[PDB]
Nucleic acid binder design. Sequence first.
RNA 1: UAGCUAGUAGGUGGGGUAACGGCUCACCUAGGCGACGAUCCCUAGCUGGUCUGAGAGGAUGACCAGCCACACUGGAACUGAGACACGGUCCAGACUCCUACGGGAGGCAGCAGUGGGGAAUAUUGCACAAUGGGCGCAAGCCUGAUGCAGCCAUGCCGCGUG
RNA 2: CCCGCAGAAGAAGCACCGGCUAACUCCGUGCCAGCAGCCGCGGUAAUACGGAGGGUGCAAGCGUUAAUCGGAAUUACUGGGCGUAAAGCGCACGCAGGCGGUUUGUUAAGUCAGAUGUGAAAUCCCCGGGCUCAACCUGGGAACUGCAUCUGAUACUGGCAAGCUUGAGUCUCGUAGAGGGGGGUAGAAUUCGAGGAAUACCGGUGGCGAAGGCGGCCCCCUGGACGAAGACUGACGCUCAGGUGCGAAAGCGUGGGGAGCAAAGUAGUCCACGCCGUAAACGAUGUCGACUUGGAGGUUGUGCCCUUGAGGCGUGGCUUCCGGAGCUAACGCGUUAAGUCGACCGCCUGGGGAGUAC
RNA 3: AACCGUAGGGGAACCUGCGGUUGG
Lengths: 121, 129, 80
Amino acid sequence: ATVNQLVRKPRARKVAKSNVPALEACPQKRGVCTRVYTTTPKKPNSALRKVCRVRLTNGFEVTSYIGGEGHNLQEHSVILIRGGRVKDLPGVRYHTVRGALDCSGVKDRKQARSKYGVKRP
Amino acid sequence: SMQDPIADMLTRIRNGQAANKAAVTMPSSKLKVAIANVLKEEGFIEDFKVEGDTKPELELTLKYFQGKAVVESIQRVSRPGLRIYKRKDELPKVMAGLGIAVVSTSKGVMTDRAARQAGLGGEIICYVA
Amino acid sequence: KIRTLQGRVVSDKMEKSIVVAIERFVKHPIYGKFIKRTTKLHVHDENNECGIGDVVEIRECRPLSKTKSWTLVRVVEKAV
RNA sequence: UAGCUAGUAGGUGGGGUAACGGCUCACCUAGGCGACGAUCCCUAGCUGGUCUGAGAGGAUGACCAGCCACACUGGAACUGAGACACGGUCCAGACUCCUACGGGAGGCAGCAGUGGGGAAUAUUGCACAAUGGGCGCAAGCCUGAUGCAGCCAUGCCGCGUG
RNA sequence: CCCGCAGAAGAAGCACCGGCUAACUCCGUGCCAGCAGCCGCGGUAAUACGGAGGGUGCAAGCGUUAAUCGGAAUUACUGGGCGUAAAGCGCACGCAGGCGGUUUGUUAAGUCAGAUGUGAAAUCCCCGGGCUCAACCUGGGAACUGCAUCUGAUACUGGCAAGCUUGAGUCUCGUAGAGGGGGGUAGAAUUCGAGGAAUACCGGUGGCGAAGGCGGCCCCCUGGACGAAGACUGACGCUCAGGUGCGAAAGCGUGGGGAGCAAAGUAGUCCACGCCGUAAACGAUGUCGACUUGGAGGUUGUGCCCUUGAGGCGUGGCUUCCGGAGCUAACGCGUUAAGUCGACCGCCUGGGGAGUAC
RNA sequence: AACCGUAGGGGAACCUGCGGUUGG
């Protein structure tokens, strides 16, 4: 553009929208796991799912996928959501770290162990 | 032109180089004569001649060494609206010193090398390379 | 003397006080274009010896009133 | 957010301050700011700097140093060279404590801690031996400033595990 | 910090292995359990799921996630675009702003050079010094890209005055055209002598107008364009956010009219005034000025040519078609640019949600 | 034939009238 068109109105920046708007600059948050679901995905995939539904301490309620190979979550247990949106099923844009507050590390793991709450044998 | 005569002169020179012309005409002025002198000193044009009494018509004689022309790149730096004034140690070196940068200092319209040697800078006029 | 900024009398309606606008040529901090910029200053003169449209020379003195800290020393030109 | 301001803009006179000044008063003139963004709404301590980037730029103000603002919330004043005053006084309100039920004492945004909130941030430690400050004619006294120590791979660097 | 004695004695983990990206084979499962930063794996021989072996990277650390910058030329001042991908206001006039053809003199505000003050210390950078090296500490310098004052330079930009004509504008003479408005008027046709609407042939790749748009003939008022030779004014110029005005068709309000057509045969289509004024208002190309090889063809002005002719030669104005250099991703544009440059304005930043709500 | 603006109508895409475009 002409230099005058920039002197009058400058170059506006591009605002950024965070992917996870409930963490509000926090790598972890505590939940309550108000409910547990097994809903179906959208894209062609071989599973139903393994998700949950926790209410963060700051009021927000967001879904949270549950990784691993079998969980032990109840309707009144606290979790620790971290992030890492999940592509397949829409609406889930979080995760659940294992072995932090009331979860447990899935069993028999011996590769990529630190990602779950599994100690060394 | 109507709002910038130096850009008109440079455009005429460039188009003459493109169309393999031998001589271009344009209304003359003191600044144009100074720029033509600076161009003929460094060797980017063969010669130049001015005629007329009340409405002069400056006429150059473009020179090409081989099939390819000599003046391959020429542009206006400080166009009216974005006047550019550079100090002594900020004078530009076009094509790593292979070209010239016609500046206008308090002594006269001179190339960038003479201005850097004398120890003064001014308003850049055009890059020639 | 002093810095002696020179401006143009914009309005003379107050009693024993005038408004003078000084001029400044400043480059834009990021685009490098010479924009024209003005600044308004309340000037205090006792004789009412100017007219709307003149060019004056003002200097700095002690604060005489709220938002009035300049005094007129000499008028250069006239209205027309 | 397109109109704002009537002690508002100016002028003589008193009054006041260490000092200029509408800071205040009585009168008169009717002005002053605004598209070069006034008024209004949200957010925000500022700077030397830090991170990134070839550079121009972009994002923030952790530690260290300068400046400003507050000291449970709101308001005024005295003493003093200096405060409209963190560990000074008085006034009005909610809080916590003592009580003979009449009335009274408090302010960890000081170091160390406790309760709570949180994903998360430490010992109710030693000494004035050094630097610095207060008083003192000097010894000397006080100094959670400061010098060190205790906890945590939080980060940078070096070594070992032959 | 130094010295001495047993004993190698007490001290290695984490992530990845299809591509991006360094590093592969077999078993359990068979679109199930699952992995995943993107592309994405399996419905029975998984180098992608889980496990074993193997090598790859880092190493007292290794990975995941939050936050900034870079890659992002992905808000482009250095450093981008608007004919078809997102992007040229529906047009004209124009205030404030942006920009200024040519010559002389003066001023020295912008600009340039030097000096003097200040730009707190640490940090960043260079040459060194010391903790057994390094991190760390520290001496000197440079830098702190900045600001103000003084002394100078005068080419450029800016201020003041006097100038010149090529930019711009005025006058004379003519030309063409559905340019606009007012009011009459004629013929064909349709309907029922009456009434309303539109003007067959001319008619065109045609003309006028800033756009929407404008058709019988004559009369009146008026606007614009073009061509030839003079004089005069002497920069009076270009663009334009806000602003005023004009602005198919449909619709709304008042009073008329209503032949044909025709939403729902009614409104409407027609008239005066008033409102709305939005479109695929399109060349999907803003306005102004300068420069750059040619050929085919329409219209018009003027000069010229035994003007002897329907005619031929230019030179101008407007306007169609094919193409060279050049531009573009391509199609294509191509002297009437989408080519080379200059001045000014609006708009563009993945698609939908949405030109939606407030 | 499609699309745009506008008006009316209809369970619904949509139908019709008026004017414009070639993105027939």
